Amino acid sequence: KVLRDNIQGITKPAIRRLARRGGVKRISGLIYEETRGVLKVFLENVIRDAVTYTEHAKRKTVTAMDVVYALKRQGRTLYGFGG
Amino acid sequence: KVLRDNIQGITKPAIRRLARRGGVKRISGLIYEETRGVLKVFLENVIRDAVTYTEHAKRKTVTAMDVVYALKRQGRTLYGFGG
Amino acid sequence: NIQGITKPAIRRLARRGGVKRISGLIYEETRGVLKVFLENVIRDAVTYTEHAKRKTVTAMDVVYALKRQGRTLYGFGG
Amino acid sequence: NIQGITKPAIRRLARRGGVKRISGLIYEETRGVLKVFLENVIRDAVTYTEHAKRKTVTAMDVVYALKRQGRTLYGFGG
Amino acid sequence: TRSSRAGLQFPVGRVHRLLRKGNYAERVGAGAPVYLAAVLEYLTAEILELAGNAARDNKKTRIIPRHLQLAVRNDEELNKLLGRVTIAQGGVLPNIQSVLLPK
Amino acid sequence: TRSSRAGLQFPVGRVHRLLRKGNYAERVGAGAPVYLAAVLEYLTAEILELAGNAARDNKKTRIIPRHLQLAVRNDEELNKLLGRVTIAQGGVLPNIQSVLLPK
Amino acid sequence: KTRKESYAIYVYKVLKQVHPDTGISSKAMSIMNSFVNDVFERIAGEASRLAHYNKRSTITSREIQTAVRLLLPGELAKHAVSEGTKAVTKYTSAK
Amino acid sequence: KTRKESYAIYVYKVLKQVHPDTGISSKAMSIMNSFVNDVFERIAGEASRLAHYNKRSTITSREIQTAVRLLLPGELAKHAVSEGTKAVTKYTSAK
Amino acid sequence: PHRYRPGTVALREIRRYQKSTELLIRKLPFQRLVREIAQDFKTDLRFQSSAVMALQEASEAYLVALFEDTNLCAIHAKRVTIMPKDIQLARRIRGER
Amino acid sequence: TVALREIRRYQKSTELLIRKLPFQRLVREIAQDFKTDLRFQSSAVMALQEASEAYLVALFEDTNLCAIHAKRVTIMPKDIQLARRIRGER
Amino acid sequence: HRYRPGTVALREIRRYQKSTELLIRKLPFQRLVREIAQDFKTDLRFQSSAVMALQEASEAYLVALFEDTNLCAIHAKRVTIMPKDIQLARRIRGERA
Amino acid sequence: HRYRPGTVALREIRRYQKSTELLIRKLPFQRLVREIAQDFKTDLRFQSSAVMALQEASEAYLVALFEDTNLCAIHAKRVTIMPKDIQLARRIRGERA
DNA sequence: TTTTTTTTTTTTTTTTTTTTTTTTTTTTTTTTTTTTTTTTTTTTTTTTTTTTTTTTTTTTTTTTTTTTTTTTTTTTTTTTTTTTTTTTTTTTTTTTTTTTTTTTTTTTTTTTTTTTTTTTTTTTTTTTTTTTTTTTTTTTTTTTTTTTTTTTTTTTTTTTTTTTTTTTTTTTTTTTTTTTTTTTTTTTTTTTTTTTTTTTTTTTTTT
DNA sequence: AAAAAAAAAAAAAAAAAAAAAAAAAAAAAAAAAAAAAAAAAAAAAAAAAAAAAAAAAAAAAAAAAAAAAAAAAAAAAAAAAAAAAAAAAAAAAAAAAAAAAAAAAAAAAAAAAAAAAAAAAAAAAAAAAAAAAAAAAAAAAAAAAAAAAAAAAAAAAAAAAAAAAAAAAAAAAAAAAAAAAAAAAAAAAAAAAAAAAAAAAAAAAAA
């Protein structure tokens, strides 16, 4: 089907939840947009890395092993699914 | 001050909760006694470690890194509290 | 090799261990467990043999590898 | 000793960074920070040196130590 | 040599020996060294051309590492490629923030 | 003859040698080598007496690691000492499960 | 007597093609050779990474293709795939 | 060639003490040598880690005794510490 | 006279507790027990709050580890109502006595 | 008071603040926009979550420290921009 | 005269409990480990000391396996062993998954 | 004639950005290297290539830190540097534990 | 309940091999002086826990039924077991052969040591101004709370496709050899960049 | 506004040393054939996505209150900045020294391979009955949740005492050199114990 607009759909209160997870007490309202920007650029980077892995795997699905490959490739060292 | 009968501070619901954390589904009423006993014995081990460490620490105060030392002696290595 | 250890050999091993009745799949399952453990052991052995630039895995290096795996054994002239 | 980095030299490097007004406190603390940098690099380099089993340090040891942190430098033929 | 047979400049047999001593796979395909040689040749062509442009800018005949640094630093994405990288006799570009100048 | 002066057997000079060539720290209290020597003669004497009793009970003048494993396995505390420590060709005691026994 | 290896002939040829009338500093040359070795080892190590990932003990130019697609900026990456495919096909047609 | 370390004489005299007439096996003394080495290793490691927990670089009898009471079972530990006190007082009596 | 099936709340809190990371021991009784054993060994030891809390989570982790080991041994033993026999089996196989 | 109550409460646990449905929606957004015909991994989605909040919160506290270094308690986008500037990514 | 299962079995149990010497024939398992050690490095000579130490390490590991396997079978209400026991046991110990 | 504050600073900044050279003469730096080297082992002959690369790398790293602090001061609305700036810069770089 | 049948455990005699002393020595330790600074030692304090009480209510304990779980039996099937015969491949002694780690030591190459002068830097000192900080307003943005709903979350269902095992024939890459040809090093040149010097004009600062 | 003041860029001439190009050494890759094994192709299979739907309810969005905090401005202290000055050591080239590290050889271990002998491990067939486990029975136990209650928890506060920091000794441990032999390596002797053969007696299994 069609894909559209979900990216912006993230509720600003969810972002503020994450920010209180970040320990920030006072927050200008002008942050949600650039947070969207940075998150989407990072995740598109990683997802495209994953797609590259999968296409060289000739597989029509994705794998968490591929996920962690991309993660460590950008430098996000994380065990739990391996190592 | 000296206090007795303190292994029962982990009350029956507390023991049941800790079992549920470990995924135990059905519990016999006899489990609580043995759990109290094993908690007692291992915690006595660790406080013996702590007492020795503090006695040699030029200190009369068991401290957090003393607990860390007791843990790492008993095969309980972990991050968080220094090292 | 892995059949240079035979089913009667596994029988003798189990009698040493007190096991009484054995299934067939036990034989190859335990053979594979032996394979994996022995392979990890020799991997540490060789890495710190030619780490110490030696053509032959020394028994002392074996002692080091096994003590790393917490399985200390005496009688090797350390 | 460690004071070999002259404060005018520090001012010059700041000018390379385009710094304008510089307080004295920065001098000594940055001296310490670079000292930390130096001890890291030397310990790693000598780690590789003894790893190479020599009592003469080599530039390859230096560069490999640098790469141990992704501190890649060129112009020295690794 | 197979270099001509692929139409390249890089040493195919030498680089294949490099791959062999690399200890990366038991066996490898024949065109793989050709492919990597081609991409490296492309990259070096690009960087040398930029450096030559830089040498034109400062009006010199030979090539200096400072030229290399200027060229790479001028382009954002090339810098991203050489992110955590530094170069002998590197230097830095002239970069001054707006408020820094007087009025 | 530091050992005779300390009233033990194991060489205090050699044990201090092994201490400081263990490169543990710079300066060392002089009581450490003597104390370590002493505790070692104690432990070897205890294990050796147990081994001798086991050997002579086994009608064996010579000490054997069968005797040593007997000594370690009978004593639960001495087992605790060699918890992650196993014996060379000592072997297992006859420890058969109850149900497996014949009726 | 040490036979150290570099790419002076190769880099010199490239210099000629991009700038016939130019020289070189051996410092910049050492930088270039280290760059060559660096990119080589990076790409080849990631190819071996793939060799583990794909459960295959062999690498092809297709492996390198995916790897460089991973490693290089988009425009350079598509240019790169262009010449890589061209050169591989040219050699395979040739002998 | 090499004069490899051994404790054969010392263990042999310990034997002659505890059991005045008792035979030996070469593997038994090898076991003894390795065992003594292990005792040294573990005791020294614990002693050093204790000495650095309380921030001191001097290897005193204090940290070795605290380590051995950490490690040895009560009977063995108290007997060992009493033996250490005896031996050190003996040496201090002499020179 | 509401009655859930025996074990329904048990499993619901199974997921709740697995999804949670909160100390279940009551804090003051735990500090009292810490004092109890400390007095058993040597009195005049000031009780750091950090030390006591560290003891709390370390003990609870040891607990929960033993719980999965014992429960899974019991499941292998074709049982889910763990009884003390499974407990000493877990202790012995772990090596602890 | 309520903002800092939210501070402590959200810094309490490690549960997944985000909701599965919208997150998966964005996943499919950033997938299909490049290539079609992909069946996803729920585990991959979980990893996407974990990484996303981890990275974000990393930015969160370090930019918060930058902003208090800016002598203030109300944040500003340029604080984040400087933070990422030193972070070395672009 | 025919002997039913179990008697000679237990006789061999006790005979192999008192005995400790190698039951695995030396050369076949030696070839096994020679070929395994060859999987990574080449031109490897092999001194018999490390060989024997390797054999004993393997055998001690194995006897731990059997003793704990029989214990697990006891825990699972059986005297015949099938491999579920070994995965359970090694997972409790912590080596395998 | 006396020049107003800032002129020297900006002129030198520009000339240094134009410049490409080390701004620390060798000998003190080498002596520091030598006195820090033996702190692990004595009698280590040094490679000039090694030490020069060391000097260059140190210079590059510290210059990077300089720009870090410059950005800090820009963020500070201040035109003077002070320690908490470098503290923040190091923290965000994460090189400090 | 009684009787047979191995089968092990026990005692004598041979030998052999392992242990134990005795010889050699060299590689390790003791003693003594000398130094020296880490470790202790004493004081100050201060904070840091310990010690208690109130207020809120949260957690624990009790109880009843019902219900659902473990255990027990029996019956099945086959799961292992056991026996005798055949297969076999172990392992063991001496001989070949390699080969292979280690180690000395000439060379050789490369680093560390002195000198000096001298200059360009560092250091220092004195105005000062711009730079920082600090203080007041204020306003404005950022926030909480209520309600509404628009939203997410759960569980089936059915699909289906999409991965996944195995088997065969393929490529195809690996191995070893010969040959032949490549890359590196030295020497020489020249050809460039460097240094210095003069000229322009361009700003900063003063009038 | 306008003009002088360094300052710095532009041009030009000497100069020096670097780049590089021809030739030789050499070291290594192309080409060649044999083949032995990874992978491709494919057919089946079954595991998971995923599409959709109702049901439950929760998160959020808008509005309003509200409030504090950030930014702007004023203003003064001062401390780096910007002059002057004196001073010294970095260096650069030459001369000195000494030693880090390595190829050829060499002495010596250290494995590995084979003949083949015999010799007990292993294999297999083939009987066969016992145990693992399902079906079913008996049962008992613990879990759920409404009540009552114990006391944990949140929150303030008082004190005395552990020990942390600040100077300062001592003393304890280290460094080096002559004195001196000890702990290990070899030879040989001898006796502890397996080998072998068999006897006493006691579990195993049939009646």
- Burial group, residue I83, by CB count within 10 angstroms (0-12, 13-18, 19+): middle
Q: Is residue D30 within 8 Å of residue L62, measured between CB atoms?
A: yes
Q: How many domains does chain F have?
A: 1
d(CA A51, CA A61): 9
Nucleic strand M under 7 Å from the C-beta of F11: yes
As given in the structure block, the two tokens for residue H1 are 């060639």
Is J69's Cβ below 8 Å from some Cβ in L?
yes
Beta-bridged to residue H23, according to DSSP, are F62
Nucleic strand M under 7 Å from the C-beta of D9: yes
Q: What is the 3-state secondary structure (H, E, C) of K7-68?
A: HHHHHHHHHHHHCCCCCCCHHHHHHHHHHHHCCCCCCCCCCHHHHHHHHHHHHHHHHHHHHH
As given in the structure block, the two tokens for residue B52 are 């020795």
Amino acid at E74: N
As given in the structure block, the two tokens for residue D44 are 């790693």
Task: Give a yes or no: residue E100 inside a domain.
Answer: no
CA distance I20 to chain J (A): 8
Beta-bridged to residue F86, according to DSSP, are C73
Chain L 23..82 CB hits on strand M (< 7 A): 44-48, 78-80, 82
Identify the three-state secondary structure at position I47: strand
Beta-bridged to residue A61, according to DSSP, are J39
Q: Which residue has the tokens 């699905």?
A: A61
Q: Which residues from chain I sit within 8 angstroms of residue J14, using beta carbons?
A: 21
Identify the three-state secondary structure at position E27: strand
Q: CB count, 10 Å around CB of I81? A: 13
- The second-level CATH assignment, the architecture, of D2-67 is Orthogonal Bundle (1.10)
d(CA E9, CA E6): 9
Q: Which residues from chain G sit within 8 angstroms of residue A53, using beta carbons?
A: 53, 66
Q: CB count, 10 Å around CB of C2? A: 16
Nucleotide showing the shortest C1' distance to residue L26 CA: N90
Q: How far is CA J80 from CA B19, J86, J87, in A?
A: 44, 10, 10
Task: For F68-83, give one letter per residue: b (16+ CB within 10 A) or e.
Answer: bbbbbbeeeebeebbe
As given in the structure block, the two tokens for residue A19 are 């920010």
Handedness of CA E67, E70, E73, E77 (dihedral sign): negative
Q: Would you call F44 and H36 a contact, using CB atoms and an 8 Å cutoff?
A: yes
d(CA E47, CA L62): 27
Report the phi/psi class of residue I5: left, alpha or beta, with left for phi > 0 and alpha for psi in -120 to 50: beta
- Burial group, residue D38, by CB count within 10 angstroms (0-12, 13-18, 19+): buried
Name every residue whose Cβ is closer than 8 Å to that of residue G19 and which is 6 or more positions away in sequence: E48, E49, E52, E55
Q: Is residue K79 within 8 Å of residue F100, measured between CB atoms?
A: yes
Q: Which residue of C lies nearest to K16 if distances are taken between CA atoms?
A: C16
Q: Which fold has domain C7-68?
A: Histone, subunit A (1.10.20)
Q: Of all helices (H) and strands (E), which one includes residue F16?
A: helix F12-21
Handedness of CA J63, J68, J71, J76 (dihedral sign): positive
As given in the structure block, the two tokens for residue F18 are 């092994």
d(CA K54, CA C59): 8
Q: How far is CA I29 from CA B9, B14, B29, in A?
A: 5, 11, 21
As given in the structure block, the two tokens for residue A60 are 């029509």
Is H62's Cβ below 8 Å from some Cβ in F?
yes
Q: Is residue A39 within 8 Å of residue J80, measured between CB atoms?
A: no
d(CA E38, CA G84): 6
Amino acid at K12: E
d(CA J6, CA G50): 45
Task: Give a yes or no: residue E99 inside a domain.
Answer: no
d(CA H38, CA F18): 13
In this complex, the chains that touch C, judged by 3 or more CB pairs closer than 8 A, are: F, H, K
Q: CB count, 10 Å around CB of A82? A: 10
Chain A 23..42 CB hits on strand N (< 7 A): 26
CA distance H84 to chain F (A): 4
Q: CB count, 10 Å around CB of J70? A: 20
Amino acid at G10: Y
DSSP state of J74: B
Question: From which experimental method does this structure derive?
Answer: cryo-EM
d(CA D78, CA D73): 10
Distance G56 CA to N39 C1' (A): 9
Q: Is residue F88 within 8 Å of residue C75, measured between CB atoms?
A: yes
Handedness of CA D2, D3, D9, D15 (dihedral sign): positive
Is G70's Cβ below 8 Å from some Cβ in E?
no
Chain F 1..40 CB hits on strand N (< 7 A): 1, 11, 14, 20, 26-30
Q: Which residue of L lies nearest to J80 if distances are taken between CA atoms?
A: L75
- Please name which of D2, D11, D13 lies closest in space to residue L28, comparing C-alpha atoms: D2
DSSP per position, H9-75: HHHHHHHHHHSSS-B--HHHHHHHHHHHHHHHHHHHHHHHHHHHHTT--EE-HHHHHHHHHHHS-HH
d(CA D45, CA D22): 33
What's the start-to-end Cα distance of chain K, in Å?
48
Name every residue whose Cβ is closer than 8 Å to that of residue G13 and which is 6 or more positions away in sequence: E9
Name every residue whose Cβ is closer than 8 Å to that of residue D28 and which is 6 or more positions away in sequence: none
Q: Would you call K13 and F97 a contact, using CB atoms and an 8 Å cutoff?
A: no
Q: Which CATH number fits domain H1-93: 1.10.8.60, 2.102.10.10, 1.10.3720.10, 1.10.20.10?
A: 1.10.20.10
Name every residue whose Cβ is closer than 8 Å to that of residue J12 and which is 6 or more positions away in sequence: none
Is chain J touching chain A, with at least 3 CB–CB pairs below 8 Å? yes
CA distance I94 to chain K (A): 6
Q: Is residue I80 within 8 Å of residue B19, measured between CB atoms?
A: no
d(CA L57, CA L78): 29
d(CA I23, CA J12): 13
- Please name which of A20, A10, A67 lies closest in space to residue J19, comparing C-alpha atoms: A10
Nucleic strand N under 7 Å from the C-beta of H95: no
Q: Which residue of F lies nearest to H83 if distances are taken between CA atoms?
A: F38
The residue of C66, C72, C74, C76 whose CB has the most chain H CBs within 10 angstroms, and thus the best one to mutate to test that interface, is: C74
Task: Give nucleotides in strand N with any atom < 7 A to a protein C-beta.
Answer: 5-9, 18-20, 27-31, 38-39, 49-51, 59-61, 69-71, 79-83, 89-91, 100-102, 109-112, 121-123, 129-133, 141-146, 151-153, 162-164, 172-174, 182-186, 192-194, 204-206
Beta-bridged to residue F85, according to DSSP, are C72
Identify the three-state secondary structure at position E38: helix
Q: Is residue G45 within 8 Å of residue G54, measured between CB atoms?
A: no
Is chain K touching chain G, with at least 3 CB–CB pairs below 8 Å? no
- Please name which of C30, A3, B42 lies closest in space to residue J38, comparing C-alpha atoms: A3
As given in the structure block, the two tokens for residue H90 are 């003996």
Q: How far is CA D33 from CA D2, D38, D40, L70, in A?
A: 12, 9, 11, 17
Beta-bridged to residue E28, according to DSSP, are G59
d(CA J80, CA I70): 49
d(CA L10, CA L16): 10
Name every residue whose Cβ is closer than 8 Å to that of residue F53 and which is 6 or more positions away in sequence: F71, H19
Name every residue whose Cβ is closer than 8 Å to that of residue D14 and which is 6 or more positions away in sequence: D22, L66, L81
Q: CB count, 10 Å around CB of A30? A: 11
- Resolution of the experimental model, in Å, one decimal: 4.9
Nucleotide showing the shortest C1' distance to residue E62 CA: M192
Considering only the C-alpha atoms of chain J, give the largest distance between any 2 of them, rounded to a whole number of Å.
51
Q: Would you call I41 and B19 a contact, using CB atoms and an 8 Å cutoff?
A: no
- Tell me which residue range forms the domain holding E15: 2-93
- The second-level CATH assignment, the architecture, of B6-73 is Orthogonal Bundle (1.10)
Amino acid at F58: N
Q: How many CA atoms lie within 13 A of I69 on its CB side?
A: 24
As given in the structure block, the two tokens for residue D25 are 């406190």
Q: What are phi and psi of H23, to 5 degrees?
A: -75, 175
Radius of gyration for the alpha carbons in chain F, expressed in angstroms and rounded: 19
d(CA A6, CA J32): 12
Every domain of chain H and the residues it spans: 1-93
- Burial group, residue K22, by CB count within 10 angstroms (0-12, 13-18, 19+): middle
- Please name which of F15, E1, J56 lies closest in space to residue A34, comparing C-alpha atoms: J56
CA distance J4 to chain E (A): 36
Nucleic strand M under 7 Å from the C-beta of E4: no
Q: Which residue of F lies nearest to K72 if distances are taken between CA atoms?
A: F97
CA distance D73 to chain G (A): 8
From the list C13, C33, C56, which residue is nearest K46 (CB)?
A: C56
d(CA J66, CA E32): 48
d(CA C51, CA K41): 12
- Please name which of L57, F11, A17, I58 lies closest in space to residue B47, comparing C-alpha atoms: I58
Q: What are phi and psi of C48, to 5 degrees?
A: -100, 0
Q: Is residue H19 within 8 Å of residue F52, measured between CB atoms?
A: yes
Handedness of CA D21, D26, D28, D34 (dihedral sign): negative
Task: Give a yes or no: residue F91 inside a domain.
Answer: no
As given in the structure block, the two tokens for residue B7 are 């292994």
d(CA H88, CA H61): 10
Task: For H42-61, give one letter per residue: b (16+ CB within 10 A) or e.
Answer: ebbebbbebbebeebeebbb
Nucleotide showing the shortest C1' distance to residue K84 CA: N132
d(CA H24, CA D60): 54
Q: Would you call J66 and L75 a contact, using CB atoms and an 8 Å cutoff?
A: yes
- Burial group, residue L77, by CB count within 10 angstroms (0-12, 13-18, 19+): exposed
Q: Would you call J35 and A51 a contact, using CB atoms and an 8 Å cutoff?
A: yes
Handedness of CA G46, G51, G57, G58 (dihedral sign): negative
d(CA F40, CA H73): 15
Is H70's Cβ below 8 Å from some Cβ in F?
no
Task: Give a yes or no: residue E34 inside a domain.
Answer: yes
DSSP per position, D5-72: S-HHHHHHHHHHTT--EE-HHHHHHHHHHHHHHHHHHHHHHHHHHHHTT-SB--HHHHHHHHHTTT-E
Nucleic strand N under 7 Å from the C-beta of H58: yes
Is L50's Cβ below 8 Å from some Cβ in E?
no
As given in the structure block, the two tokens for residue I69 are 């080991």
Q: Which residue has the tokens 């968080």?
A: B80
Angle at D60 between CA D55 and CA D66, to 5 degrees: 110
Breaks (C-N over 2.5 A) in chain K follow: none
What domains, with CATH codes, occur in chain I?
Answer: 2-97 (1.10.20.10)
Q: Which residues from chain B sit within 8 angstroms of residue H66, using beta carbons?
A: 52-53, 55-56
Angle at H69 between CA H64 and CA H70, to 5 degrees: 95
Name every residue whose Cβ is closer than 8 Å to that of residue B66 and which is 6 or more positions away in sequence: B49, B50, B53, B54, B57, I48, I51
d(CA E68, CA E49): 10
What's the start-to-end Cα distance of chain C, in Å?
30
- Please name which of L69, L76, L71, L75 lies closest in space to residue L90, comparing C-alpha atoms: L69
Q: Would you call D74 and G37 a contact, using CB atoms and an 8 Å cutoff?
A: no
Q: How far is CA H57 from CA B49, B55, H51, H63, H89, in A?
A: 22, 18, 7, 11, 24
Radius of gyration for the alpha carbons in chain K, expressed in angstroms and rounded: 17
d(CA C8, CA A53): 48
Strand boundaries in chain C, DSSP class E: 21-22, 72-73
Q: Would you call B21 and I34 a contact, using CB atoms and an 8 Å cutoff?
A: no
Q: Would you call J88 and E76 a contact, using CB atoms and an 8 Å cutoff?
A: no
d(CA B9, CA C15): 47
With the CA atoms of I85, I90, I92 and I95 taken in that order, what torsion angle do they form, in degrees rounded to the nearest 10?
-160
Superfamily of domain A6-74: Histone, subunit A (1.10.20.10)
Identify the three-state secondary structure at position F86: strand
- Please name which of C19, E69, F89 lies closest in space to residue L60, comparing C-alpha atoms: E69
Q: Is residue J70 within 8 Å of residue J45, measured between CB atoms?
A: no
CA F33 to chain centre: 18
Nucleic strand N under 7 Å from the C-beta of I29: yes
Amino acid at H95: K
Radius of gyration for the alpha carbons in chain D, expressed in angstroms and rounded: 16
